[PDB]
């Protein structure tokens, strides 16, 4: 419904495909030896790159540049882990460039504990059967980044004033493309709680990695402390 949603939606869809991952980074999932060392480095590169495309994508979300500035950093630092999941989920499920079956092994031998690899791909498979469209991936990303519930937020109501419209547009989209089962909107929103569970375990993977001398880029260090 409404035309004003289209002015808000497609402009978000403008930003969601403005930048893909550079070919200079994706092609080494193929070209280079499958070492536990180089596996981690490639993943570091892509994670490094993805923080950049997210900051640009969020910088355009309507009303983001108007928020307080000590809170936008808390928005980014609290959502970067989860938004990287959505994009890599869209890659694994659509099987796009991402080199799915080869990227997954490079992930499976990067020093990650087995108790974190199992629930990770169970998520990947589960969110694949949802047969989600690109606009659903794009909005869910916007809603995750603009989460008023994040840690060290001061003006929590300000975030709600910009997350609320995008939530209504999305449920008004499970109106058109699926009128058969009204629960699809509640099924996409479950994923955002799934991602929160992962954000808990991700802090553990990080400390396990640097225990073992895994240097990150300066920017991942800043966004994960």
């Amino acid at each position: 419904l409404t035309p004003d949603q289209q002015t808000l939606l497609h402009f978000i869809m403008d930003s969601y495909n403005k930048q893909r991952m550079p070919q200079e980074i994706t092609n080494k999932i193929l070209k280079e030896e499958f070492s536990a060392e180089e596996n981690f480095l490639i993943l570091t590169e892509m994670a490094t790159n993805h923080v950049q495309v997210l900051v640009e994508f969020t910088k355009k979300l309507p009303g983001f540049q108007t928020l307080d500035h000590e809170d936008q950093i808390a928005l980014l630092k609290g959502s970067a882990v989860e938004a990287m999941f959505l994009r890599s989920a869209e890659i694994f499920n659509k099987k796009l460039s991402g080199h799915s079956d080869l990227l997954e092994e490079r992930i499976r031998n990067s020093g990650i504990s087995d108790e974190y690899i199992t629930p990770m791909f169970s998520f990947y498979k589960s969110i694949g059967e949802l047969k989600m469209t690109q606009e659903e991936y794009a909005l869910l990303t916007a809603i995750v980044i603009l989460s008023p519930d994040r840690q060290y937020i001061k003006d929590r109501e300000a975030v709600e004033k910009l997350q609320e419209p995008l939530l209504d547009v999305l449920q008004k989209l499970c109106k058109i493309h699926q009128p058969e089962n009204p629960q699809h909107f509640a099924c996409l929103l479950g994923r955002l709680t799934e991602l929160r569970t992962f954000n808990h375990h991700h802090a553990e993977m990080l400390m396990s990695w640097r225990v073992n001398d895994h240097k990150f880029t300066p920017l991942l260090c800043e966004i994960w402390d």
């Binding site: 950049q52 900051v55 640009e56 910088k59 500035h69 936008q72 950093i73 980014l76 630092k77 300066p218 920017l219 800043e222 966004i223």
Partner: peptide
């Protein structure tokens, strides 16, 4: 203190 995040939010 959020040196690099603030730089990309202003580029």
């Amino acid at each position: 203190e959020n040196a690099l995040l603030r730089y990309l939010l202003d580029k």
